[PDB]
Paper text:
The ComABCDE pathway is the quorum-sensing system in some species of Streptococcus, such as S. mutans and S. pneumoniae, in which autoinducer peptides are processed from the precursor ComC and concomitantly exported to the extracellular space by ComA and ComB6, 7. In this study, we focused on PEP as the target of potential inhibitors of the Streptococcus quorum-sensing pathway, established a reliable high-throughput screening system using a synthetic substrate for PEP, and successfully obtained a compound that was found to allosterically inhibit PEP and suppress the quorum-sensing pathway, which eventually led to attenuated biofilm formation.
In the crystal structure of the original MuPEP1, this pocket is occupied by residues from the adjacent protein molecule, which would explain why the complex structure could not be obtained. Therefore, we prepared another form of MuPEP1 with the four N-terminal residues truncated (tMuPEP1), a form that was found to be crystallized in a different space group from that of MuPEP1. The side chain of Arg66 occupies the vacant space of this binding pocket in free tMuPEP1, whereas it is rotated away to avoid steric hindrance with Compound 2 in the tMuPEP1-Compound 2 complex. There are no other significant differences in either the overall structure or the catalytic triad residues between the free and complex structures of tMuPEP1.
Author numbering:
A (entry chain C): 6 to 24, 38 to 140
B (entry chain A): 6 to 140
């Protein structure tokens, strides 16, 4: 589960992306979903974004890994990486150096998750 | 329910901002809120709406909620919500009230403007992010 951690309080977008700062745009308020999409396009990846709910993790034909837009307190533009699910838990990567790859409850992820999932494939 | 429509492909953020700051008197040009909210080619981010609304003399609180939020009658309308509309992954609405199983929303889209919307459709578009602001 190779995850590249964040450094600045703004590079969360790029940080999930790699797992660059200018390609999306990333400015002071972090990246916008459209920015992640655009930047992933430039890098030779097909992208489809979807608005989903928890049933997305019931699907067996889900192509991991992918990006999710999440809200952490007042990090209203946060992003995770989703590598898989196991039992009733998710394996996610948080660019936040204090978190990185973690087991996370499906409940907790539901509380943070926008429903925005960005899928990419070459 | 007054609503400042969007013109540019990017100004949805600024447009909901003006549309609300208008409700408590203040009038601002979209070209300016654009600058305050740091809106670029890729629209505004929730942080942009928050910062800009503060700068405009508003105490603001953002929250992550679900539809149960509208089962609380002492909800103070109006407020801004982050929604997903098609490829418009950053769209925003104004929420003016609720009546029946339906909400009254303001969509800066000149073709939409103020509209009633079912609880279901709004649930499908909505992030859960609600931005409440007060002078």
């Amino acid at each position: 589960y190779k995850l590249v951690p964040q450094i600045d309080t703004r590079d969360c977008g790029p940080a999930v992306l790699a797992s660059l700062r200018e390609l999306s745009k990333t400015n002071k308020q972090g990246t916008t979903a459209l920015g992640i999409v655009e930047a992933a396009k430039k890098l030779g990846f097909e992208t489809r974004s979807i608005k989903a709910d928890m049933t997305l993790f019931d699907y067996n034909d889900l192509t991991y890994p992918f990006i999710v837009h999440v809200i952490k307190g007042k990090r209203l533009q946060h992003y995770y990486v989703v590598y898989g699910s196991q039992n009733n838990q998710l394996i996610i990567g948080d660019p936040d150096p204090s978190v990185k790859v973690t087991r996370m409850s499906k409940e907790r992820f539901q509380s943070e998750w926008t429903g925005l999932a960005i899928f990419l494939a070459p």
